[PDB]
Design a protein around this ligand. Structure first.
Ligand SMILES: *[C@@]([C])([C][O])[C@](*)(=O)[C]([C]C1=[C][C]=[C][C]=[C]1)[N]C(=O)[C]([C]C1=[C][N]C2=C1[C]=[C][C]=[C]2)[N]C(=O)[C]([C])[N]C(=O)C1=C([C])C2=C([C]1)[C]=[C][C]=[C]2
Ligand SMILES: [Mg+2]
Ligand SMILES: [Mg+2]
Ligand SMILES: [Mg+2]
Ligand SMILES: [Mg+2]
Ligand SMILES: [Mg+2]
Ligand SMILES: [Mg+2]
Lengths: 226, 204, 195, 196, 222, 211, 233, 195, 196
C-alpha cells in the first residue's frame, strides 16, 4: 500500500494506490483505499485491511450521530481523537495506520495516525510499504503555498513512485480533493497506467469439453401455491 | 496444525453476461487422509449463494448461522436478502470475532433481483471485502486458481461458455493440489433459473 | 481411547470399539465399553482423552434422555448428531475443550433407514456408509473401500468387520484387546456376545 | 529524542528537538514535543509517543476540570497527576515526562518523571535518548538565576550537542518560554545551531 | 544471527517441442518489497546447445551456472571436444547439487536443449539434485500459478472431445514454436498480474538444431 | 508416496505411485520411484527424492564394480547391505530414505527393506511411504505364495490404487515391475484417474464414489 | 557469524551518457551514536574505478586493504600496468564478489553492501552491486540500505530504462544524486550532512569531490506546526 | 527393539526375545531374530535404536570370530562379556554412542556352568541368574523373584518363561508379536521351534 | 571505565580513572588502566580486563621484537598490531583500546580501536562506559595545539564529569604525559577533582 496526504492553499488532498495483497499474491487489482468518515472528512488506510475499514465505519457512524446531536458539521479533530482513543485502547492489536484529512468550519486539516494511538500533524505525509518512495518525491517537490492543481500532481506523483518502486503497491491511483467552501470531489481511478495488454490467444473452450456426471434444477423460489 | 489447511478445499466464483457461476470441490480430509467425497461447500439463502472454504466445523457453523440470520431478515423485511446486503452481513459477522476468528474463506455469488446486475465478492477470515468484477477464489489451491482464472477468464461470457471456463479453472487447479479434489460441483446462476452440475474428475 | 469403527449396512448400523484402557505402560482394563445409549434407537461410541470422553458422552446422554421425557418422542439420529456437533463446536473455542471424537449410529424409525455420523472434537460432522476415528481408518478404509456394498446384510457387515479387525491386530503396534460390537436396527440396540 | 527544561530568574524555559523515528527511518522531522496541559504548565514528552500523548491528553482533561472547580492548579499538582498515571500503569507504559510551569507565587518550577513513575523537583532537567551525551556539559554550564537570553543560549548549546551525537535526535530546536509576561514560542533551525 | 540465504524472486518456464525447446524467465530481481534490477538476465546459454536457469537465491544460482559452464569446458578438454548430451548434463548437475547436500544451493534449476534423437528436452531439478525429464515445467515464485495452466494447454488435461461426454480424451497433438511462445507470454502476463515478484521483462531462449535464439518482451513494471 | 513389493512363487512384484509433493503443492505427477540398478535388481524410492536417487545410483555403480572384480552378479543381501552401511555413516545428519532392494539371485527371489534410520530387513511383503498403511490392507488380505503372474501384477496395482485414492500425497500413475530369474520386466505406466474408474466398474469397488 | 559494530549507511549511484556517478556520506555510526564524522567510504582504484561501501567499517577497512594490495600485485611483472593490462572495474568487482560469496559460504561474512562504479577500456559504463550474501545485480541506478528505498525512486525518474542513459547528461545526473543525498539527510537517522561524490567519465576521467554539504534545505514550514492534533498555541 | 529376557538355570541359559520390528505406526516384521551367535557356546541378544543394534551386534560377532580363528580357542562367556562392556563404555563418550542394551548367555565349558550377563548401553555389566532390559523386567521380575531356583531344569525354566510372557501379553500396551526362545548349554545353541 | 587521550602542542596525554567492577562491587579502586607497550607508546584499555591485558601483552611482545630488528616503531605501527588482533579475533574479544604515542617526526598521535577492530586516527579520543556523558563537554572544550597545563585541565575536567555520572567509573585520575622531554606520570585524587 502507498497512501499520501498533501495540504494546499485552500484545502487538502489525499491519494492512494489500488492494490491489495495476500503475501506475494495480489487479491484485488482495484481496491478502494480511500474511505469516507464524513462527507468532507476522508481517510486512507494501510496495514490490516479489515481493521482500517472497520475502524473507519465505526468512527464515521459515531461522527454522524455526533453531527446530528450537536447540529454542527463534523470536525477532523473529532475523528482524530475518537480514532486514537479507540486504537490506543486495543494496544496496536487493531493494525490500522491511517492518514486523515478534511475540511470543517475551523479550516483544512491533515493528520496521520498509527495503530498504537499516536498522531502527527503535517503539510505532507505518507504511509504504507511505499511510504519511503512517496516521501522521497514529497521531500523533493513539496513547497509552501501550493495550488490545488500543483497538489494533485504532487500527490499522484508520490503514489506513482510507490506503484513503480514498491512491490506491495500497484495498479491505479485514487484521489480525493477537499477544498474549503466546496463539496469534496472523489476521483476514483484518477490515473490508469497499468492496463493489461491484449492476450495472444483466446482460451474459450468448445462446448462439451468438460465431462459431466449429473444435472439438476436448483429450486431457489419459495414454496408455491395450489 | 494450520486450521485453514487441515480439511482442505476450494471455491471459485465468476461473473458472465447476465449470469454468475460458483463452484467447489467435494473433498473433506484430515490432513493426508481423505474422509468424505460429498462435503459440499456451497450453500444458498434464497437466491444468494455462499461458498465457504477452510476449517470444516466453521464452514458448517457459519452456514447454520447465515441461515439463521437470513430467515429472520426475511420475516422482518418481508423480502429475500440481496447479494450486496448479504455481503455486508458476512463481513460484519466475521469482524465481530476479530480476536477469535472463524478460519474460513467465504465467497458470495448472486444476481440482484431488482437491478439484474451480477455480483460476486470474497472475504478474508476477518471480514475484509474483495468486490471483484471478474472472479473470486478461495482455498488451499488459491494460488493455482488465481493463475487459471487470470489466464482463462474473459468478460461477458454466456452461461454455457462460462460453465466450461470455471469448470476447467477448478479441475486443473484441484489436480495440482493434494488437499483438493475428490469430486466437484458447479452452479450456473441466471436471474430466474439455477442449474447444478457434478463434474467427473480423477479420484486421487 | 484407541479404535472405534462404524459401518452402515442395509437395515442396521454396526459399531465396533476397542476394550483396552491404558495409563502409561499398564493396561488397567481389557473389557471397557466405550459407548452410551442416547436413545433406544441411537448409540454413540467415543474416543479421546481420559475423563473428557465419559464426561461428554454422559452429558449428551442426559440431554437426549431429558428431551425424550419432555416430548415423549425419540429424536431422529440426524437431530441428535446435529446437537452433538454444536456442543463440540461450542467446546473447541472454550477455555478447556472436550478432547473427544465420536461415532453416532442410529436407526431412523420414520424413514426406516440406518444412519451413521462421524464427528471429531472440532465439531466436524459427516454422514457416512462407514467411518473410523484416529489411526483406525488408516488400516481399515482400504478393505471397506473394496468390499462395501450398501445392500449388505448384517452378517456380511460383521464378516467385513472381522476382516478389518484382523488387519488391525496384524499391523497396529498397540494391543487394544479386541473389540465390543453392537448392532443398531429397527428392534433397538443389542450386543454381539461372541466376536 | 532530546528534551530539557531550565528554570531562570524570570521563570522557566522548555526545550526539545523535533525528530521522531521508527527504527532508523525518520517518520516526522518537524515534531512538536512541547505540549500544553494548562495555560502556563507545559511538558516535554519522551518514550512511546502513543503513551505520552494519551497521558498528556488525560492530564489536560484533569487540569481543565480542576480549574473549573478550584481555580488555577500549581505546577506541583500537574506533576502529581502525571505521576499518578505513570506510576499506577508502569507495567503498560513507556513514558519519560518533564513537567514545567510558571506561578506568580512559586515562579518557575521543573519536575521530571522517569520510567518508574517517581517524581523529582529540580532546578533544571534533561531527558530522552540524547540527554546522555550532555550530562557533563549541562552540569558544568548551568547556573541559577540566569537571564532569559543566557538560558536560551544554554538550552540551544546543550540540545545542539545532543542532536550532534544522537541519531534519534535532530531537526529543529523548539523552545517555550514561561514567564509573567506570557507564553513565547521559539524555533531555531539547523543552519543556526549546527555552527555553534 | 547471520542468515546465509535470501530470496531474489523471479519465475522460470521450460517447454519441450518435437524438434525444439524453450526456456523462459522474467528479468526482475528483488529483495523483500524492493526492486534491485528490472533487467538482470536469469537464463544462460551454457554451450553445447544447452540453456540453463537456476531460480531462487541468486548468489547460489549464479554459482551453480558458473560451475556447470566450467564443467562443460572441462568435459571438452578431457574427452576430445565431445558434445555434452542433455541427459549427461542433467546427471552432472545432480552431482553438483548433492555435493552440497548439507549446505544446499537454494535454487530450482531447469535446463533445456535437444536429446540425441534431435527431439526437444526439458529437465527439472530440486535444490539437492533429484531430477526428471519433462515436457513442461514452471519453477520459482509463480510456479504454482503457471503449471496448472500448462497441464491444461500443453498436455490437454481434464479436456475431452465434445459429444462423447468424458468417454474420449482430447488427443495429444504436438505444439509449434509459435504456439508455445504464445503460451509462454500469456503465462508470464498472467503471473505478472497476480504475483508481485514477477514483472518488468521476459526473456525467452529458443533451442533448435540451428542454435540458440533469443526473444525479449516487456512486462508490467508495477 | 506409496511403494510396495512382495515375493511370490514366480519372483517379486514391485509397484509404486508417481506423485511428488512440495508441501500441499503437487510438484510433479510423472516421477519414477523405481530405480534400475541392474537387469536383475530394482530399488524403490520414498522420502527424500534426491537422497534416494543419489545413494541408489551410487549403489548401482558399487554393484557393477563388484561384478567386474568377482565375475559374478551381486546378491540381493549384499547389495542391500552396501546401501545400509553407506547411509549409516550419515545417521542423524538429516537423510530421509525408505527403500526396497528387490531382485533374483542364487537364493531365489529376494526382497530387503532399507531405511536411513538403520533398519535392514528381509521379508516377503513390504510397503513404504505415506500411503503404505492403506496398501497393506489389500496386500495382507489377498496375498498368497501360489499367485499367478497376472493376479500378482493386479494385486500390486490395486494396492497402490487404494492408497492413491485415500492418501493426498499419493497418486498420479502406477508403475509396475515384475522380477524374474531371467531379469526384471516393466509392466507399464497406468494413470490413476483412468484406472480408478475402470477398476470401479469392473470390480464394483469404491461404491461410495459416484461415476 | 558476527554482528556489525561501527557502520556506514547508504551508498548511491547512477549511470549517465558518458560515465557513472557514485556518492556516500562521511559518517561512521556506533548504533544510535553518531561516533565518527570523518570517514571516507568511497575508495578509488586506479583512475577508472570507485568502490563505494556500506555496512561494517572494520570489514570496509579490510576490503580497502585488499584493493590496495590488488593494485600492487597487478603491477608485478606487468609492463602494461598503467595501460592495456591495468585493472578494470569488472576485474575488481568479480574479485570482491568471489570473496564475499566465499566468506558467506564459511558462515563468516564481510558485513557489507558494495557498489563498484567505473568505466571500462572500451568506454562502456560499469555499475554493479554485491553484498554479504554474495548476491549480485546491475541496473542503471543502484543504491544500498536506505538509498534503495528513497534514492532509487528519484534516480529512476531520470533513468528509468537502458535507453534513457544516452539522454542523460553529467549535470542532470549529478543534480539528481545531490538531491537524493539531501532527501536521505532529511529521512535517514543514521546519515550526515557531509558527504563525498565521485564522477568517472570516459572523457574527463576520475573527479573525486570531498567535503560536500547538503544545502538548500527546507525547514521554515516547521514554525507553523504546533502540537500533535488539537493544540493551537 | 522392545523385550529381551534371560534366565540361567542349572545346566543352561535361556534367552527370550520379541519378534516385532516397528517403524512409527506400522509393524514391519513379526518374525525378527534379535540375536547373534558370538561363538558356539555364547549367544548375545540385543535391543535399542534401529541400526545401532545390528551394527554393534555384528561388529562384536566379527571380533569374537576373529579371536576364535587366531587362537583356535573359544573365549569364556566372562571374557566375551568384558570385551562387550569395554566397547560400550568406550562408545558412551564417543561422538555418536551405540544405543544398544544386550544380554550375553553362554556355557563355560571349562567350569561346566551356565552364565548370564546383563549389559546396558552405558557399559554397566552385572552377572545374574535372570535379567531383562527396558520395561520388560518391570513386569517379569516379581514372578522370577518368586518362582526361581538355581537347581531348575531347562523345562522348568521354559514354563517360568511362558508365565513371564503371559504376564507381558496381558499388561503391556504394545504388541511385541511373541518371542523367539533359544537355549545355550554344553551341546551348543538351539532354538525352541514351538512357543 | 572512563579513558581518553588528547594531543597537544608538545605531544600527547593519556588519561583514565581507576575503577574496576564486578557487577556493582568494586573489585579494585586503584587500577592502572594506562599501560605501556613501548617507551613512548601507551594505551588505555576498556572492555574485558582479561582480553585487553592479553592483547597488550602480545603487542608489547611484537613491538619489542620489532625494535630488536627494525628500530623504534611508529605509533601507527603499534595501532596496526592492536587492530590485527582485535579484528581477527573479534568473535572472541570484548576490547576497546585507545593507542597513543610520541615520535619526534610525527609528534603526538592518537588512534582509537572500538569493538569491531576498526582504526580511527584522531586529535583526541574518548572511550569506556563513562565517555558517553562527556561527548558534549569534550567537543565544546577541545582545541588543537593546547599547552601542557591546558590539556591536563581539559582531561581532568572531562574525566571528573565522567566519574560523576558513571557508576562504573571512579577512584583516582591517572595521567601519562608523552613528550620529547620524556614520560611523566600524574595522579589526581577525589578531593581535588570532585570540587571542580
Ligand atoms: C510421497 C509423495 C510423500 O512421501 C513420496 O514419498 C515422494 C517420494 C518420491 C518423490 C519423488 C521421487 C522419488 C520419491 N516424496 C516426495 O514427493 C518428497 C516429499 C518430501 C520432501 N521432503 C521429504 C519428503 C518426504 C519425506 C521426507 C522428507 N519430495 C521431495 O523430496 C522433493 C520435492 N524435494 C523438495 O521438495 C525439496 C527439497 C529436497 C528441498 C527443498 C524442497 C528445499 C530446500 C532444500 C531441499
Ligand atoms: Mg491421493
Ligand atoms: Mg542527529
Ligand atoms: Mg509496485
Ligand atoms: Mg557400503
Ligand atoms: Mg544393566
Ligand atoms: Mg562514580
Amino acid at each position: 500500500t502507498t497512501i499520501v496526504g498533501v495540504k494546499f492553499n485552500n484545502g487538502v488532498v489525499i491519494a492512494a494506490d489500488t492494490r491489495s495483497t495476500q503475501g506475494p499474491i495480489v487479491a484485488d487489482k482495484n481496491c478502494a483505499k480511500l474511505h469516507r468518515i464524513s462527507p468532507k472528512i476522508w481517510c486512507a488506510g494501510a496495514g490490516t485491511a479489515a481493521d482500517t475499514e472497520a475502524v473507519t465505519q465505526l468512527i464515521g457512524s459515531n461522527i454522524e450521530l455526533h453531527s446530528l446531536y450537536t447540529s454542527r458539521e463534523p470536525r477532523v479533530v473529532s475523528a482524530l481523537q475518537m480514532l486514537k482513543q479507540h486504537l490506543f485502547k486495543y494496544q496496536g492489536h487493531i493494525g490500522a495506520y491511517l492518514i486523515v484529512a478534511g475540511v470543517d468550519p475551523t479550516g483544512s486539516h491533515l493528520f496521520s495516525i498509527h495503530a498504537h494511538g499516536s498522531t502527527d500533524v503535517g503539510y505532507y505525509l505518507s504511509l504504507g510499504s511505499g511510504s519511503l518512495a512517496a516521501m522521497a518525491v514529497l521531500e523533493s517537490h513539496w513547497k509552501q503555498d501550493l495550488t490545488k492543481e500543483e497538489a494533485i500532481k504532487l500527490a499522484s506523483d508520490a503514489i506513482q513512485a510507490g506503484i513503480w518502486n514498491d512491490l506491495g503497491s500497484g495498479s491505479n491511483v485514487d484521489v480525493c480533493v477537499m477544498e474549503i467552501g466546496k463539496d469534496a470531489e472523489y476521483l476514483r481511478n484518477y490515473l490508469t497506467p497499468n492496463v493489461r495488454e491484449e492476450k495472444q490467444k483466446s482460451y474459450k473452450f468448445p462446448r462439451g469439453t468438460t465431462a459431466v456426471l449429473k444435472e439438476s434444477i436448483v429450486n431457489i423460489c419459495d414454496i408455491q401455491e395450489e | 496444525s494450520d486450521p485453514s489447511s487441515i480439511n482442505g478445499g476450494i471455491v471459485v466464483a465468476m461473473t458472465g453476461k447476465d449470469c454468475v457461476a460458483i463452484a467447489c470441490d467435494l473433498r473433506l480430509g484430515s490432513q493426508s487422509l481423505g474422509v468424505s467425497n460429498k462435503f459440499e461447500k456451497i450453500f444458498h439463502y434464497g437466491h444468494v449463494f455462499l461458498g465457504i472454504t477452510g476449517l470444516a466445523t466453521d464452514v458448517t457453523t457459519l452456514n447454520e448461522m447465515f441461515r439463521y440470520k437470513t430467515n429472520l431478515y426475511k420475516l422482518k423485511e418481508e423480502r429475500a436478502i440481496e447479494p450486496e446486503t448479504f455481503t455486508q452481513l458476512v463481513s460484519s459477522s466475521l469482524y465481530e470475532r476479530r480476536f477469535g476468528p472463524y478460519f474460513v474463506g467465504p465467497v458470495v455469488a448472486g444476481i440482484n433481483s431488482k437491478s439484474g446486475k451480477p455480483f460476486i465478492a470474497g472475504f478474508d477470515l476477518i471480514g475484509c471485502i474483495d468486490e471483484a468484477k471478474d472472479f473470486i477464489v478461495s482455498g488451499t489451491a488459491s494460488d493455482q486458481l488465481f493463475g487459471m482464472c487470470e489466464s482463462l477468464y474473459e468478460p461477458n461470457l454466456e452461461p454455457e461458455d462460462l460453465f466450461e471456463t470455471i469448470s476447467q479453472a477448478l479441475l486443473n487447479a484441484a489436480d495440482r493440489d493434494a488437499l483438493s479434489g475428490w469430486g466437484a460441483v458447479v452452479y450456473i446462476i441466471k436471474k430466474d433459473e439455477v442449474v447444478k452440475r457434478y463434474l467427473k474428475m480423477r479420484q486421487d | 481411547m484407541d479404535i472405534i469403527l462404524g459401518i452402515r449396512v442395509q437395515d442396521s448400523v454396526i459399531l465396533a470399539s476397542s476394550k483396552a484402557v491404558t495409563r502409561g505402560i499398564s493396561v488397567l482394563k481389557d473389557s471397557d465399553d466405550k459407548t452410551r445409549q442416547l436413545s433406544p434407537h441411537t448409540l454413540m461410541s467415543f474416543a479421546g482423552e481420559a475423563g473428557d470422553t465419559v464426561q461428554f458422552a454422559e452429558y449428551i446422554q442426559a440431554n437426549i434422555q431429558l428431551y425424550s421425557i419432555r416430548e415423549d418422542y425419540e429424536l431422529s439420529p440426524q437431530a441428535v448428531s446435529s446437537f452433538v456437533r454444536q456442543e463440540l463446536a461450542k467446546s473447541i473455542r472454550s477455555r478447556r475443550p472436550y478432547q473427544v471424537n465420536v461415532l453416532i449410529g442410529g436407526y431412523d424409525k420414520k424413514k426406516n433407514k440406518p444412519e451413521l455420523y462421524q464427528i471429531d472434537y472440532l465439531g466436524t460432522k459427516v454422514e457416512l456408509p462407514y467411518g473410523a476415528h484416529g489411526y483406525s481408518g488408516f488400516y481399515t478404509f482400504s478393505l471397506l473401500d473394496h468390499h462395501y456394498r450398501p445392500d449388505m446384510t448384517t452378517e456380511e457387515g460383521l464378516d467385513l468387520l472381522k476382516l478389518c479387525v484382523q488387519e488391525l491386530e496384524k499391523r497396529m503396534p498397540m494391543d487394544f484387546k479386541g473389540v465390543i460390537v453392537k448392532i443398531v436396527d429397527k428392534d433397538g440396540i443389542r450386543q454381539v456376545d461372541d466376536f | 529524542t532530546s528534551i530539557m527544561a531550565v528554570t531562570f530568574k524570570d521563570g522557566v524555559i522548555l526545550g526539545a528537538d523535533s525528530r521522531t523515528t521508527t527504527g532508523a527511518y525518520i517518520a516526522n522531522r518537524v515534531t512538536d514535543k512541547l505540549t500544553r496541559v494548562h495555560d502556563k504548565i507545559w511538558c516535554c514528552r519522551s518514550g512511546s509517543a502513543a503513551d505520552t500523548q494519551a497521558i498528556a491528553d488525560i492530564v489536560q482533561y484533569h487540569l481543565e476540570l480542576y480549574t473549573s472547580q478550584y481555580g488555577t492548579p500549581s505546577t506541583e499538582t500537574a506533576a502529581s497527576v502525571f505521576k499518578e498515571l505513570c506510576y499506577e500503569n508502569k507495567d503498560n507504559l513507556t513514558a519519560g515526562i518533564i513537567v514545567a510551569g510558571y506561578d506568580d507565587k512559586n515562579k518557575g518550577e521543573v519536575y521530571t518523571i522517569p520510567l518508574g513513575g517517581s517524581v523529582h523537583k529540580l532546578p533544571y532537567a534533561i531527558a530522552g535518548s540524547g540527554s546522555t551525551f550532555i550530562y557533563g556539559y549541562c552540569d558544568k554550564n548551568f547556573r541559577e538565576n540566569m537571564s532569559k537570553e543566557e538560558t536560551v543560549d544554554f538550552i540551544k548549546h546543550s540540545l545542539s550537542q545532543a542532536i550532534k551525537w544522537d541519531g534519534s535526535s535532530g531537526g529543529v530546536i523548539r523552545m517555550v518560554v514561561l514567564t509573567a509576561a506570557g507564553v513565547e514560542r521559539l524555533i531555531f533551525y539547523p543552519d543556526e545551531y549546527e555552527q555553534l | 544471527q547471520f542468515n546465509p540465504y535470501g530470496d531474489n524472486g523471479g519465475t522460470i518456464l521450460g517447454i519441450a517441442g518435437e524438434d525444439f525447446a524453450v526456456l523462459a524467465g522474467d528479468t526482475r530481481n528483488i529483495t523483500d518489497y524492493s526492486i534491485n534490477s528490472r533487467y538482470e538476465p536469469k537464463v544462460f546459454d551454457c554451450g553445447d546447445n544447452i540453456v540453463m536457469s537456476a531460480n531462487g537465491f541468486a548468489a547460489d544460482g549464479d554459482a551453480l551456472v558458473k560451475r556447470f559452464k566450467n564443467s562443460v569446458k572441462w568435459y571438452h578438454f578431457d574427452h576430445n571436444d565431445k558434445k555434452l548430451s542433455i541427459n549427461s548434463a542433467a546427471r552432472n548437475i545432480q552431482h553438483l547439487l548433492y555435493s552440497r547436500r548439507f549446505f544446499p544451493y537454494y535454487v530450482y534449476n531447469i535446463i533445456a536443449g535437444l536429446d540425441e534423437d534431435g527431439k526437444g528436452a526439458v529437465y527439472s531439478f530440486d535444490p539437492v539434485g533429484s531430477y526428471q525429464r519433462e515436457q513442461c515445467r514452471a519453477g520459482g515464485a509463480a510456479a504454482s500459478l503457471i503449471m496448472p495452466f500448462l497441464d491444461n494447454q500443453v498436455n490437454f488435461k481434464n479436456q475431452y472431445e465434445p459429444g462423447t461426454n468424458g468417454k474420449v480424451k482430447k488427443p495429444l497433438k504436438y505444439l509449434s514454436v509459435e504456439e508455445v511462445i504464445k503460451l509462454v507470454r500469456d503465462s508470464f502476463t498472467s503471473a505478472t498480474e497476480r504475483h508481485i515478484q514477477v514483472g518488468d521483462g521476459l526473456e525467452i531462449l529458443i533451442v533448435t538444431k540451428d542454435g540458440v535464439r533469443k526473444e525479449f518482451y516487456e512486462l508490467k513494471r508495477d | 508416496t506409496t511403494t510396495l513389493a512382495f515375493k511370490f512363487r514366480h519372483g517379486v512384484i514391485v509397484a509404486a505411485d508417481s506423485r511428488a509433493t512440495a508441501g500441499a503443492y503437487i510438484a510433479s505427477q510423472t516421477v519414477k520411484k523405481v530405480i534400475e540398478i541392474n537387469p536383475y535388481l530394482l530399488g524403490t524410492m520414498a522420502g527424500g527424492a534426491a537422497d534416494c536417487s543419489f545413494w541408489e545410483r551410487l549403489l548401482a555403480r558399487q554393484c557393477r564394480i563388484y561384478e567386474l572384480r568377482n565375475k559374478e552378479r551381486i546378491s540381493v543381501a549384499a547389495a542391500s547391505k552396501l546401501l545400509a552401511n553407506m547411509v549409516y555413516q550419515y545417521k542423524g545428519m538429516g537423510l530421509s530414505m525408505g527403500t526396497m532392494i528387490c531382485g533374483w539371485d542364487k537364493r531365489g527371489p529376494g526382497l530387503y527393506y532399507v531405511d536411513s534410520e538403520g533398519n535392514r530387513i528381509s521379508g516377503a511383503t513390504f510397503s513404504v511411504g505415506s500411503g503404505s498403511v492403506y496398501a497393506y490392507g489389500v496386500l495382507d488380505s489377498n496375498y498368497k505364495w501360489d499367485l499367478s503372474v497376472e493376479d500378482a501384477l493386479y494385486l500390486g496395482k490395486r494396492s497402490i490404487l487404494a492408497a492413491a485414492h485415500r492418501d493426498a500425497y499419493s497418486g498420479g500413475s502406477v508403475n509396475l515391475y515384475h522380477v524374474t530369474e531371467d531379469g526384471w520386466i516393466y509392466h507399464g505406466n497406468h494413470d490413476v484417474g483412468e484406472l480408478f474408474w475402470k477398476v470401479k466398474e469392473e470390480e464394483g469397488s469404491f461404491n461410495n464414489v459416484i461415476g | 557469524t558476527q554482528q556489525p559494530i561501527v557502520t556506514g549507511t547508504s551508498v548511491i549511484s547512477m549511470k549517465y551518457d558518458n560515465g557513472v556517478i557514485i556518492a556516500a556520506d562521511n559518517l561512521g555510526s556506533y548504533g544510535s551514536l553518531l561516533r565518527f564524522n570523518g570517514v571516507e567510504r568511497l575508495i578509488p582504484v586506479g583512475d577508472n574505478t570507485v568502490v563505494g561501501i556500506s555496512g561494517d567499517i572494520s570489514d570496509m577497512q579490510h576490503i580497502e586493504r585488499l584493493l590496495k594490495d590488488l593494485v600492487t600485485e597487478n603491477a608485478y611483472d606487468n609492463p602494461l600496468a598503467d595501460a592495456e593490462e591495468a585493472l578494470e572495474p569488472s576485474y575488481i568487482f568479480e574479485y570482491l564478489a568471489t570473496v564475499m560469496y566465499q566468506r558467506r559460504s564459511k558462515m563468516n561474512p564481510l558485513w557489507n553492501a558494495i557498489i563498484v562504479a567505473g568505466v571500462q577500456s572500451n568506454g562502456d559504463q560499469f555499475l554493479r552491486y554485491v553484498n554479504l550474501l554474495g548476491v549480485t545485480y546491475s541496473s542503471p541506478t543502484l543504491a544500498t540500505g536506505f538509498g534503495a528505498h528513497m534514492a532509487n525512486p528519484l534516480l529512476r525518474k531520470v533513468v528509468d530504462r537502458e535507453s534513457d542513459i544516452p539522454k542523460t547528461t553529467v549535470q542532470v545526473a549529478e543534480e539528481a544524486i545531490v538531491n537524493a543525498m539531501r532527501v536521505l539527510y532529511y529521512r535517514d537517522a543514521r546519515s550526515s550532512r557531509n558527504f563525498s561524490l565521485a564522477i568517472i567519465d570516459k572523457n574527463t576521467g576520475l573527479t573525486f569531490k570531498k567535503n560536500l554539504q547538503v544545502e538548500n534545505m527546507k525547514w521554515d514550514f516547521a514554525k507553523d506546526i504546533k502540537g500533535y492534533g488539537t493544540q493551537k498555541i
